Write a protein that binds this ligand. Structure first.
Ligand SMILES: Nc1ncnc2c1ncn2[C@@H]1O[C@H](COP(=O)(O)OP(=O)(O)O)[C@@H](O)[C@H]1O
Ligand SMILES: [Mg+2]
Lengths: 228, 248, 70, 230, 240, 253, 239, 239, 238
């Protein structure tokens, strides 16, 4: 029971995509927090060398002027999923002129994820976190290679996701201002994951219902560094 | 198993099947493109050894792509035949589109590219044929090229593949000549290397097949050497070795 | 592995065939059903001294066999 | 070995399945084809398992064209599918070029189809060795093709069971200036050497290409050559 | 294990040993008998029913092949459903093309062709079901054909499939099945089904009767045993 | 084998017979030699001769003998083989057909070997660790060196390579004379013609041809051999009587 | 479940075949690209003209655009294939799109081609990595690297191949954060890197320069030896 | 031995296709013999109708078929394969009549069936049909012909050689019957066939236990002999 | 096992153990319960929780004004089947303005699930589905399994720990037949309660409801809708 997803184990589990979850594990982490003020995503670059352009690693992306994305796992498959999410938003908006619900974006990307043994390749070894706003609420969602997705208020994916997830669970509540949730995320990432914060290997992206511009955080981390 | 399918790398990244194709070429009949100026030649001795062999074409190793293009054959027989037909087809496409002769490097790259494409896809066996090209074009004129099963191609002024290919290129690098080394000296050196590589004492005329391209009238001619010219060429080389003996 | 092992079996057999020392009077005889097979390396004359055929008994020979047993 | 799959190479560079096909060849029906000064003679045996088998019901020498005769190594059904393909290919050439197909070119196309069957991972080659006699531009041609897709020209050759004896026979029992009658005599003599058991009009069949046309021998002529002669 | 892995490679000994697993699969399912009476064919099928969580007539094993063609199956139920759809397709194709009713022999041979073709391809497997088709053409008579997972189509005056093929056939053999009329045949079928392990070890089950016949106007119908339940009384009287 | 015997004489005999130069030069002595060539080309014969002349003991263990049916046995057998090597002190170690374990290994499937490689790396450690390299050397033979791998060949390991090509005209003459020295020849024998009529001889097949001529003499109860006997013995030892028509020019050219 | 394939994962999730492609790239020769203040320079080594061989035919540096150039290191057959694809893509993009080609778009195209070639059964991945240098970064120089995993990144200066471990550290040793004034200085640094050639001779290094506005520029061996001499004079200063 | 027999499109080291030999091991189909005889004006085929159970309708149990008013067929093999081969023959004959305007000859029909078996033998897509086949037909002023076609993909249609469980005894009996010179009438031909069946099977041969098809130049319409004719022949040979 | 890799190979047992492993894949999912009355058809699903701050996964799906489903299995296959029901309901309404009868839809689902079970190199959809519907013929509750067998059932429960709920449903089978909507939904809630361990009881977090009726369209009830349903129901004593 090793050739592919088309084989069922005696316990029913398909012995192909558990390795896809393990492929989620080998990737660098990503954190997402859902707050009433705004939905935020934090991401570690795992930068090999400073000669690298840090922005060249697209582990934090802008799906649309109302939704951003982070993810863990394989970067190429992640980029393909991001490309589909962007073209889906473009097509749906250009046709219906209504804003794409972030949950609908997750649905479309998941429906693509169901294209390895469901038609006529292999599971997309990457898990995604979406943070967006819409006319009915600001939301954060998570999805995995299996094509399932879930609404989360505070989610961690990738390597060492357990400890970061435990800290995120312990610090989170339903009435946090986005500033306090952001700061808790930064201090947690600092203590558990690698080191003190710096613009070279960490990235942040926030979304607010009334802000379709500057979906990222860039060239302003300075005020954080002295006051973290 | 890694070596069973062409699309699987070794853990070191090497591909076993194309390597097996080259070790196959190791069995191929000795054949070389010799070092020549104002002309070129593609000598290819025939491994066919039996009395009742008719050799009615009088050529089974060197195939003329056009009056300005000739190619050698060293590999699987049927693969070589289909590949030569594909060479003629591709040259026909280029000529029919442009009404101009195809350059040497462009045709060589096209064949090597389709070979690589065939080796790349699964369920398909790599073409176990390496070959040589002798040609003249507008851009570079006289050119001799070597190509392998993987789709790799390169330019060589004098090269040999097949049986004792390493030894052949070794003594070619040994008594290497350059510049004033014209076509006739190329025939002499080809005769020398063929007598050295082959185990036959007093190498027989029918055992060897030689062709050469020369720019006549600017329209060029490719002549495959008949029995008589090979005969006095080999006889002259024998008396040349006798002359080398006379020095002692 | 079975194929490699049978090849080593054949090679060891040939090595022992050429390797049994002089002044040892061992004889080695092999039976076969087809004999159109069998590696010519084993059929090499340096270690094969005679090849004897045993075809199906025809007339006369069948008569002799029947008489002998009966 | 590397024979269960057709589309892979062995470490030594051999594709073992096709020499397995060649081993199926030369285990089949013995047959001998020689080229005389004027014509080309191909002879093959007709000996079945039981006397019930009406052998005239199954010819083995088949005229591809009025100027082409064809014989196989013994793989019957594969020979039949290949001979159907060869006949259709000869017809295509005859209509496209408005001229009869050259013997060498016909063998080239047949071997090209043969090579086409020497690839993929779900097919097998026809383990048949093909002897083709023909007349082209006043010249006689004898060619041999093999399941590997290769083809060659022979003044004289043989394949099938006990083929090495036929090779030695045509080595010493041949000269290129043989007349047609003496060519058929040489063919039946090497058939006698290669075959086991006597022959009559029933047991052999022969096709001869002459520059005017090709024709397969009637069994009566086959007995005339084989019996009361040699 | 030999070469008994796919139904396209001819295993040691002419027996494939692959379809002879489909016969074992058919052996697993409960019995189902059928009797050709004077004017019609009666299909009596027992379906084991766990009364727990049931729907008193769910997933019934009687299906309509054609307005006149009835059928019974034993073996895998999903294969039975799919091949019932296939038989309906074939009957509709004949009806549309030829402009009149399909003979049962031709329908049976085409369904057997479908089964036999599915037995062969490597990428597919033979059906794990054996079935029995009945019809009545008022023009010439009644037709009946039983086809196995291998695709063998043979006629029976009376036949059976399932877990008690030989026992049910022995029970049928002493029926005066030459001449009587389907009405008493319904009771005969019911008591024959009940006599072969009605509920001896298995807790509960349900009996379904299909009927094609001249007195039934020649179309395919489910016997309305709700009237006086005479066959049910006979089957339970078969207690001793 | 004069060229081959001179190279091997240097590489093996010079250290054992004259260690002082290596002590004078400071460099450690070379450890072992690999031999490659067609089968029957006197590789084992030459190794045995070197063992005899350098007065060192001869120990032979074939690579086919190394495999065994159990894990943990090839390692044990190789290590104890070198235990006999050390306890016999001045000696030479022969691994005939080391390519049997110096071969391609199964790269996954329904099974695997994993033990041929293990015996290889054990031998590789033993000769790499230059275990008591005082008057002890190793020698191995491989048919068709191409199948062998470079794992044993890596620089600090076995140092020298030797080629054993098929005997040429003069070599065939020498082998014929050597093996027919015991034979009862007759005037009119012209061994040069027989040597010419045997192109591409394998050396051992020359021993085959003289044995065949003797067998022809024996089956006629003659204790003497003639030119005709060798001439018809060539007809049987030519070894292409089963060849020249397995379709070689075709599908391989 | 070990690798044995391209479309299955090891139990820990790694795809071993892309790693094997990475190793196949590691077998290839050195290739070190940089971008300077305004110009981009490239130098390829280990030409090893085999006497009878003429070096020019292999074309270790190939230009497929109005302005873009570098070969792909690894197996040169895949290099020629992707060369043909890059020619087709650049010409088609220039003919079809309202504006000409940019380096980012062609880099993404190559990465997507490699990914789509990897993402299937029975399709051997392109085991070749490359270093792309382009001119139209809004009239600025920039450098990308392409990895057989179907991945692309944007370097200030990168090295791939046999010296990937070494020269990168060399880069990390002296890639000046001051933008290289007199980009000839960056070319001299590239020559110093090429002194770390597989043969280390430096007499057969093939070099290209493009000033982000110019077309392809090729450096002859004598003028490249001039920069080698300047680098040697700088090195002799330690006295 | 194992390995060259797991798949059809693989040759053995001796060149033997194992699977074609395997397919012959179901042609046995214990119960059928299919003796075919040719006489100076007739062609007869007879098979051993071994009915295993009483409840089956004997009409459906038949194993002889017809697709041509002047061509008769008898099969010996697995029943579903037999009926599929019969349907394929019907398809081919219907195509031939629709195309050429006249019905397919017996020789051409058996050749087409054998070619179908051949193309399924050469390609691993499908299992070859496991059943042997015999036609009887008439060729214009040329006579009666009996033809055999087997899963080997080849045909020899000759004189007899019944492809049933009693292979060698029946074949030798037919040889011995033809090995002695004698006339050949329809009654004599059917007598030869029935004597062969009786001597190779040694059963009492009740009329319902066998089924006979026949063609004759006197009336070229292929017919199945009635049980009355079968019993008349049985009593004629019994006395 | 030699004969257990794919659905195309038969076991000597007269079985295909790949289909059985699909059944195990189904029972790996959490429990879902379905029950119908002469008035309404109701289904309830145990929504598995992922964390104390993540949404409990939806297990009741809704595609028709009169048909709904509850899934137990791989979400991929279940949602593909849900999109399939979307397609069929839509073209049926397009063809003859008829809300598709649930029985024929379930038969089509079984037929389309049978195809993977007979073809090599294609996994069967390893999900079990409970279907609730109301049509011109009556109320209806079905189940569909990867063995492509479809069943009609008054009461039913699939997934992990389903046996206690199945026994409870058997016991109250004598009740459902004339039970009203509230009684039926409360009995379904208690049936789902039967599956849970002692410490786990019915809560709006893990409970999802889906109801179709002769006078009401099929609708799904969740936290804010489930909360009125749970209040007033008997608690769980020890
Ligand atoms: N050049 C030679 N001179 C004398 N005898 C030879 C020569 N070559 C081969 N032989 C004989 O042939 C045999 C080859 O045996 P061996 O050395 O084991 O061959 P290999 O080393 O190839 O296995 C030896 O017994 C030897 O007597
Ligand atoms: Mg030796």
């Amino acid at each position: 029971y090793d050739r592919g997803v088309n084989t069922f184990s005696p316990e029913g589990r398909l012995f192909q995509v558990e390795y896809a979850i393990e492929a989620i594990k080998l990737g660098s982490t990503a954190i997402g927090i859902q707050t009433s003020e705004g939905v935020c995503l934090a991401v570690e670059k795992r930068i090999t060398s400073p000669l690298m352009e840090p922005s060249s690693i697209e582990k934090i992306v802008e799906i649309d002027a109302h939704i951003g994305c982070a993810m863990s796992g394989l970067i190429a498959d992640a980029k393909t999923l991001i490309d589909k999410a962007r073209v889906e938003t473009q097509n749906h908006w250009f046709t219906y002129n209504e804003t794409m619900t972030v949950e609908s974006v997750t649905q479309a990307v998941s429906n693509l994820a169901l294209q390895f043994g469901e038609e006529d390749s292999r599971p997309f070894g990457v898990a995604l976190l979406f943070g967006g706003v819409d006319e009915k609420g600001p939301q954060l969602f998570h999805m995995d290679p299996s094509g399932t997705f879930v609404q989360c208020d505070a989610r961690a994916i990738g390597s060492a996701s357990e400890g970061a997830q435990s800290s995120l669970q312990e610090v989170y509540h339903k009435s946090m201002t986005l500033k306090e949730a952001i700061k808790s995320s930064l201090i947690i990432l600092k203590q558990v994951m690698e080191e003190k914060l710096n613009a070279t290997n960490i990235e942040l992206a926030t979304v607010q219902p009334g802000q379709n511009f500057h979906m990222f955080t860039k060239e302003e981390l300075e005020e954080v560094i002295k006051d973290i | 198993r890694y070596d069973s399918r062409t699309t699987i790398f070794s853990p070191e990244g090497r591909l076993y099947q194309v390597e097996y194709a080259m070790e196959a070429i190791g069995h191929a009949g000795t054949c070389l493109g010799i070092l020549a100026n104002d002309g070129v030649l593609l000598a290819a001795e025939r491994r066919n050894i039996h009395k009742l062999l008719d050799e009615v074409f009088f050529s089974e190793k060197i195939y003329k792509l056009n009056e300005d293009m000739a190619c050698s054959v060293a590999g699987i027989t049927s693969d070589a035949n289909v590949l030569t037909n594909e060479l003629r087809l591709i040259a026909q496409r280029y000529l029919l589109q442009y009404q101009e002769p195809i350059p040497c490097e462009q045709l060589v790259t096209a064949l090597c590219d389709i070979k690589q494409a065939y080796t790349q896809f699964g369920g398909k066996r790599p073409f176990g044929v390496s070959l040589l090209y002798i040609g003249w074009d507008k851009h570079y004129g006289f050119q001799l090229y070597q190509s392998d099963p993987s789709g790799n191609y390169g330019g060589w002024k004098a090269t040999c593949i097949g049986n004792n290919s390493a030894a052949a290129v070794s003594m070619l690098k040994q008594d290497y000549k350059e510049g004033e080394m014209t076509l006739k000296s190329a025939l002499a050196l080809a005769i020398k290397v063929l007598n050295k590589t082959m185990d036959v004492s007093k190498l027989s005329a029918e055992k060897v097949e030689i062709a050469t391209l020369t720019r006549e009238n600017g329209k060029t001619v490719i002549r495959v050497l008949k029995q008589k010219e090979v005969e006095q060429l080999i006889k002259k080389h024998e008396e040349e070795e006798a002359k080398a003996e006379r020095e002692k | 592995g079975a194929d490699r092992e049978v090849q080593r079996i054949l090679l060891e057999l040939l090595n022992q065939m050429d390797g049994f020392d002089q002044n040892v009077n061992v004889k080695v005889i092999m039976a076969t059903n087809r004999a159109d097979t069998l590696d010519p390396a084993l059929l090499r004359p340096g270690r094969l001294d005679r090849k004897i055929e045993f075809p199906l008994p025809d007339r006369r020979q069948k008569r002799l066999i029947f008489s002998t047993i009966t | 070995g590397y024979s269960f799959s057709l589309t892979t190479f062995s470490p030594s560079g051999k594709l073992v399945q096709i020499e397995y096909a060649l081993a199926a060849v030369a285990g089949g029906a013995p047959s001998v084809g020689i080229k005389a000064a004027n014509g080309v003679v191909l002879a093959t045996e007709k000996k079945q398992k039981s006397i019930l088998y009406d052998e005239r019901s199954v010819h083995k020498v088949e005229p591809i064209t009025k100027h082409i005769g064809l014989v196989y190594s013994g793989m019957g059904p594969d020979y039949r599918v290949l001979v159907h393909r060869a006949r259709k290919l000869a017809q295509q050439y005859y209509l496209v070029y408005q001229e009869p197909i050259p013997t060498a070119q016909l063998v080239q196309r047949v071997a090209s189809v043969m090579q086409e069957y020497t690839q993929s991972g779900g097919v097998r080659p026809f383990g048949v060795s093909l002897l083709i006699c023909g007349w082209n531009e006043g010249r006689p041609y004898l060619f041999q093709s093999d399941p590997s897709g290769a083809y060659f020209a022979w003044k004289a050759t043989a394949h099938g069971k006990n083929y090495v004896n036929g090779k030695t026979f045509l080595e010493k029992r041949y000269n290129e200036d043989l007349e047609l009658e003496d060519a058929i005599h040489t063919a039946i003599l090497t058939l006698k050497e290669s075959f086991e058991g006597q022959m009559t009009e029933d047991n052999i069949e022969v096709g001869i290409c002459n520059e005017a046309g090709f024709r397969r021998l009637t069994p009566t002529e086959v007995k005339d050559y084989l019996a009361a002669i040699a | 294990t030999g070469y008994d892995l796919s139904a396209s490679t001819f295993s040691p000994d002419g027996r494939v040993f692959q379809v002879e697993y489909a016969m074992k699969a058919v052996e697993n399912s409960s019995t189902a008998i059928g009797i050709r009476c004077k004017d019609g064919v009666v299909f009596g099928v027992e379906k084991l029913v766990l009364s727990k969580l049931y729907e008193e007539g769910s997933n019934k094993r009687l299906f309509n092949v054609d307005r006149h063609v009835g059928m019974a199956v034993a073996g895998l139920l999903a294969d039975a459903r799919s091949l019932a759809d296939i038989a309906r397709e074939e009957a509709s194709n004949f009806r549309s093309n030829f402009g009149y009713n399909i003979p049962l022999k031709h329908l049976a041979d085409r369904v057997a062709m479908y089964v036999h073709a599915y037995t062969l391809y490597s990428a597919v497997r033979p059906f794990g079901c054996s079935f029995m088709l009945g019809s009545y053409s008022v023009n010439d008579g009644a037709q009946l054909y039983m086809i196995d997972p291998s695709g063998v189509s043979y006629g029976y005056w009376g036949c059976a499939i399932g877990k008690a093929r030989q026992a049910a056939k022995t029970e049928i053999e002493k029926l005066q099945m030459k001449e009587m009329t389907c009405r008493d045949i319904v009771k005969e079928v019911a008591k024959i089904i009940y006599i072969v392990h009605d509920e001896v070890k298995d807790k509960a089950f349900e009996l379904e009767l299909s009927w094609v016949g001249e007195l039934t106007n020649g179309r395919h119908e489910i016997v309305p045993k709700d009237i006086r339940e005479e066959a049910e009384k006979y089957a339970k009287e078969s207690l001793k | 084998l004069d060229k081959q015997i001179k190279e091997i004489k240097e590489v093996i005999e010079l250290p054992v017979k004259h260690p002082e130069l290596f002590e004078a030069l400071g460099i450690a002595q070379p450890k072992g030699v690999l031999l490659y060539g067609p089968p029957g080309t006197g590789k084992t014969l030459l190794a045995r001769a070197v063992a005899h002349h350098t007065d060192c003991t001869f120990i032979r263990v074939s690579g086919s003998e190394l495999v065994q049916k159990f894990i943990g046995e090839g390692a044990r057998m190789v290590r104890e083989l070198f235990v006999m090597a050390r306890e016999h002190a001045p000696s030479i170690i022969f691994m005939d057909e080391i390519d049997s374990i110096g071969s391609s290994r199964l790269e996954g499937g329904s099974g695997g070997d994993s033990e041929v490689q293990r015996t290889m790396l054990e031998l590789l450690n033993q000769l790499d660790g230059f275990e008591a390299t005082k008057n002890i050397k190793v020698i191995m033979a491989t048919n068709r060196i191409d199948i062998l791998d470079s794992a044993l060949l890596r620089p600090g390991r076995i140092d020298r390579k030797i080629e054993f090509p098929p005997p040429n005209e003069e070599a065939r003459l020498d082998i014929l004379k050597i093996h027919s020295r015991k034979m009862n020849l007759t005037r009119g024998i012209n061994l040069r013609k027989i040597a010419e009529l045997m192109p591409g001889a394998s050396g051992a097949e020359v021993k085959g041809v003289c044995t065949e001529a003797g067998m022809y003499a024996l089956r006629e109860r003659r204790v003497h051999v003639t030119q005709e006997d060798f001439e018809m013995a060539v007809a049987k030892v030519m070894q292409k009587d089963s060849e020249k028509n397995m379709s070689i020019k075709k599908l391989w050219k | 479940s070990y690798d044995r394939a391209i479309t299955v994962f090891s139990p820990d999730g790694h795809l071993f075949q892309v790693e094997y492609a990475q190793e196949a790239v590691k077998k290839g020769s050195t290739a070190v690209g940089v971008r300077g203040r305004d110009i981009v320079v490239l130098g390829v080594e280990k030409k090893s003209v085999a006497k009878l061989q003429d070096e020019r035919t292999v074309r270790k540096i190939c230009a497929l655009d109005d302005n873009v150039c570098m070969a792909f290191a690894g197996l040169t057959a895949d290099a020629r294939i992707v060369i043909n694809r890059a020619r087709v893509e650049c010409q088609s993009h220039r003919l079809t799109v309202e504006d000409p080609v940019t380096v980012e778009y062609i880099t993404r195209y190559i990465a997507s081609l490699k990914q789509r070639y990897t993402q299937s059964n029975g399709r051997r991945p392109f085991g070749i990595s490359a270093l792309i240098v382009g001119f139209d970064f809004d009239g600025t120089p920039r450098l990308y690297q392409t990895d057989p995993s179907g991945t692309y990144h944007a370097w200030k200066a990168n090295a791939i191949g046999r010296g990937a471990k070494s020269v990168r550290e060399f880069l990390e040793k002296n890639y000046t954060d001051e933008a290289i004034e007199t980009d000839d200085l960056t070319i001299k640094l590239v020559i110093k890197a090429l002194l770390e050639v597989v043969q280390s001779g430096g007499k057969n290094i093939e070099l290209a320069v493009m000033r982000r506005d110019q077309s392809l520029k090729i450096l002859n061996p004598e003028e490249i030896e001039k920069y080698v001499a300047e680098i040697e004079k700088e090195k002799e200063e330690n006295e | 031995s194992a390995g060259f027999d797991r798949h059809i499109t693989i040759f053995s080291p001796e060149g033997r296709l194992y699977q074609v030999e395997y397919a012959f091991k179901a042609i046995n189909q214990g119960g059928l013999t299919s003796v075919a005889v040719r006489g100076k004006d007739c062609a007869v085929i007879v098979t051993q109708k071994k009915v295993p159970d009483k409840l089956l309708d004997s009409s459906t149990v038949t194993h002889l078929f017809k697709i041509t008013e002047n061509i008769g067929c008898v099969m010996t093999g697995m029943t579903a394969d037999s009926r599929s081969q019969v349907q394929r023959a019907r398809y081919e004959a219907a195509n031939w009549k629709y195309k050429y305007g006249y019905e397919i000859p017996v020789d051409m029909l058996c050749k087409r069936i054998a070619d179908i078996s051949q193309v399924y033998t050469q390609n691993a897509e499908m299992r070859p049909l496991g059943c042997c086949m015999i036609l009887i037909g008439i060729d214009e002023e040329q006579g009666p012909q009996v033809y055999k076609c087997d899963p080997a993909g080849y045909y020899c249609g000759f004189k007899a050689t019944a492809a049933g469980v009693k292979q060698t005894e029946s074949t030798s009996f037919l040889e011995k019957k033809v090995k002695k010179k004698f006339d050949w009438t329809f009654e004599q031909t059917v007598e030869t066939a029935i004597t062969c069946l009786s001597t190779v099977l040694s059963i009492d041969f009740k009329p319902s236990e066998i089924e006979v098809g026949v063609v004759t130049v006197e009336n070229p319409k292929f017919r199945i002999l009635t049980e009355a004719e079968i019993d008349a022949h049985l009593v004629a040979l019994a006395e | 096992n030699q004969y257990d890799n794919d659905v195309t190979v038969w076991s000597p047992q007269g079985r295909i153990h790949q289909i059985e492993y699909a059944m195990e894949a189904v029972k790996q999912g959490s429990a879902t319960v379905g029950l119908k009355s002469k008035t309404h058809a109701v289904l309830v699903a145990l929504k598995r929780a992922q964390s104390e701050l993540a949404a409990h996964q939806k297990k009741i799906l809704h595609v028709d004004n009169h048909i709904g489903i509850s899934i137990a299995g791989l979400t991929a296959d279940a949602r593909l089947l849900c999109n399939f029901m979307r397609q069929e309901c839509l073209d049926s309404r397009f063809v003859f303005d008829r809300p598709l009868p649930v029985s024929r839809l379930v038969s089509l689902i079984g037929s389309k699930t049978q195809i993977p079970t007979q073809r090599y190199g294609r996994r069967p959809y390893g999900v079990g589905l409970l279907i609730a519907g109301y049509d011109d013929m009556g109320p209806h509750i079905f189940q569909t399994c990867p063995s492509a067998n479809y069943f009609d059932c008054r009461a039913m429960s699939i997934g992990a720990r389903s046996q206690s709920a199945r026994t409870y449903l058997e016991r109250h089978m004598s009740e459902f037949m004339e039970c009203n909507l509230n009684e039926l939904v409360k009995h379904g809630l208690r049936a789902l309660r039967e599956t849970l361990p002692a410490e786990q009881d019915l809560t709006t977090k893990n409970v999802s409801i889906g109801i179709v009726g002769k006078d009401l369209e099929f609708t799904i009830y969740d936290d804010d809708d489930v909360s009125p349903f749970l209040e007033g129901l008997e608690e769980r004593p020890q």
